[PDB]
């Protein structure tokens, strides 16, 4: 990134190092980038890359025959370098995502292929979905949203460095209703305690998903007052991560809700699939259910769509009535101040301070316009 | 109680009253005692007195025939003044408790009329009480000792002013492990706070037994602290009740434990046995496990047992080999006084200071010459 190209006569690069880490540093300015690899090389005989690229072209319906699955292996990038092929294939009939009918040896999707498929999800990961989703319809919370959101909480990756000793005081003051919840899923306090006295994380033990447990209940608490609304620096003060890490959760939790969704819904599971079906467009905007309404219209997120629902704006079909003036007094109150804000300056009236994408500079006034005609164009293609 | 026999000249006795209240006082000078009732009277053709007198003489083995019945009716108070009976023979038969063999019509008990006679437990309590059993033995929590003694915790009458208000107050400071067994029990949080926030005592409908879960468990978390040995003023400020009112309760859990104890011993219950026939002991005297073989010594209760056993005598055996002068020592430490005592006075060497029952005074060091000697002769019977 060092050099503009039409600006810059050169570009330079300056590497700061010591006497001790000299050496290292001249590494890097002769190095070079290391070979690509297959990723779906081989103790392992199975891998996940394979089983899921044996699972599309099954499911999809491209290849049949064991003679199609060689020929695939063909094309793949870890043939073209110069058995394991026919052990994906067993593991897809042996957790029933494949079936084999002896026309010798012709293999076709089964209902768990069907939907593995359409969900985006990796066949290993759907194993464990499938038998946690079984385990929640067998004893459901349903007083709180907490148990639904554990349910489209994602835990493949770590998204915050999470303090223990904070969690451990969130939960005892964690009320009764939520700490069945916990129970109900795994969250043992005992582990809890030795998190906190000691710093042993373990997880060397393959069983230890019992760490991803915990892991993924302190996620679902953060998600569960992100969609009640709760502000970000509280939830920052909270819980101890930025908001940079909330918002990266946030995006991945709203499409993750989705392939649970439709996961469900290809296995026939309509009451599971009712209750998740809400909370795809909560996660992404971090809202309640009144705002999921006017979050709608481009330019209104969570804290402009409160701010109007308070004011008496519940709905487009109310928002496309609206005085355009009165929007923009109302979006003006959003505003966070340092000081107990909420002089007369009349030459910020061409000030363009609202950030678009893909953007122009909109000032509040040009704003409030676009929401109230985007309002009407949207409530007339209601009808 | 106004006059001594052999003292007195005359007894005085005087009602004060005001001028209001005078008509009523002057009802009681002339007033004298009502008849006698029979209390076995009669829109009830069925009656507790009755119920369990008719059991008795079965399951006794007096009592077989029908004949036998009515002939026993004649013998009763209420027949003495001058069809029920036969109501109360058919609701034995028709709860279990009886059984019926047309020797046209003899009736003989069952296992569940035996137990209730060998527990002198009333046949109105029993049908409540053996549910609520074979409702714990489905799911039970043994983590603590809560669980049981709510088994064994009386609830037949009042034994003191609950405050709920400080009720709530324990409520959200009890642990998780206590608050599982609550939730076992029927304890909903909801009616906890339907009583702080109004005074509705309700129990109008019989259904209301709720009000009587929650005292049950207010006062089994009362006799959990007493087998703990936690000090009796520390339970007097943190529940709100007197040292009286707390003696009087323990002593009827203590009685209350055994029946329990006996009617699962009848009933082939040999697990809930086993763990029930522990805290008959425990409540009596209000210890630990550790000291009931010290408490078998006449003069140790709770406070003397506990000093003697932090002071490296554990056991009756431990405690024959002890030094008198000793165990006099010890025995001082456990006096409590306002100021933080644990001048010379010799004059005190005779003062009797310790209370027994039939006593004479005994002095702290006749009193350890007394519980060596008694520990000797307890330790010699014990082989
Ligand atoms: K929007
Ligand atoms: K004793």
């Not at 050099?3 to 300056?14: L, M, Y």
């Not at 009939?93 to 990796?122: C, D, M, R, W």
């Not at 194993?127 to 493949?156: C, S, W």
Request: net charge positive.
């Amino acid at each position: 990134r060092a050099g503009r190209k039409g600006v810059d006569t050169v570009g330079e690069s300056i590497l700061i190092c010591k006497n001790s880490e000299k050496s290292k540093g001249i590494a890097l300015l002769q190095g070079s980038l290391k070979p690509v690899r297959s990723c779906l090389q081989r103790g392992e005989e199975v891998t996940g890359s394979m089983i899921r690229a044996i699972l599309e072209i099954i499911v999809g319906g491209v290849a049949s025959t064991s003679q199609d699955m060689h020929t695939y292996a063909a094309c793949t990038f870890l043939a073209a370098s110069m058995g394991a092929i026919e052990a994906c294939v067993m593991w897809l009939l042996e957790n029933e995502f494949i079936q084999s009918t002896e026309e010798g040896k012709v293999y076709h999707p089964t209902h768990l292929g069907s939907a593995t498929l359409s969900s985006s999800l990796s066949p290993a990961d759907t194993l464990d979905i499938f038998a946690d989703l079984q385990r929640a319809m067998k004893g459901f919370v349903l007083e709180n949203d907490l148990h639904i959101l554990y349910l489209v909480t994602p835990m493949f990756e770590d998204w915050t460095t999470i303090d223990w000793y904070r969690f451990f005081c969130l939960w005892e003051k964690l009320p009764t209703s939520m700490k069945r919840v916990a129970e109900l899923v795994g969250v043992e306090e005992g582990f809890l305690a030795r998190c906190v006295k000691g710093k042993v994380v373990a997880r060397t033990e393959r069983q230890h998903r019992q760490m991803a447990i915990h892991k993924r209940f302190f996620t679902s608490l953060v998600l569960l007052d992100l969609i009640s609304e709760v502000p970000l620096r509280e939830i920052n003060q909270k819980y101890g991560c930025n908001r940079g890490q909330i918002q990266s959760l946030q995006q991945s939790a709203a499409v993750y809700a989705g392939m649970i969704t439709v996961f469900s819904n290809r296995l026939g599971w309509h009451n599971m699939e009712l209750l998740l079906s809400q909370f795809q467009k909560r996660l992404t905007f971090g809202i309640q259910r009144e705002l999921c309404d006017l979050v709608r219209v481009s330019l209104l997120n969570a804290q402009r769509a409160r701010v109007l629902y308070a004011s008496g704006f519940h709905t487009v079909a109310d928002l496309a009535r609206a005085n355009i003036v009165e929007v923009e007094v109302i979006l003006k109150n959003a505003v966070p101040f340092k000081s107990a804000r909420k002089e007369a300056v009349e030459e910020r009236r061409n000030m363009r301070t609202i950030w678009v994408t893909g953007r122009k500079g909109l000032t509040e006034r040009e704003a409030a316009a676009l929401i109230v005609e985007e309002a009407r164009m949207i409530l007339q293609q209601d009808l």
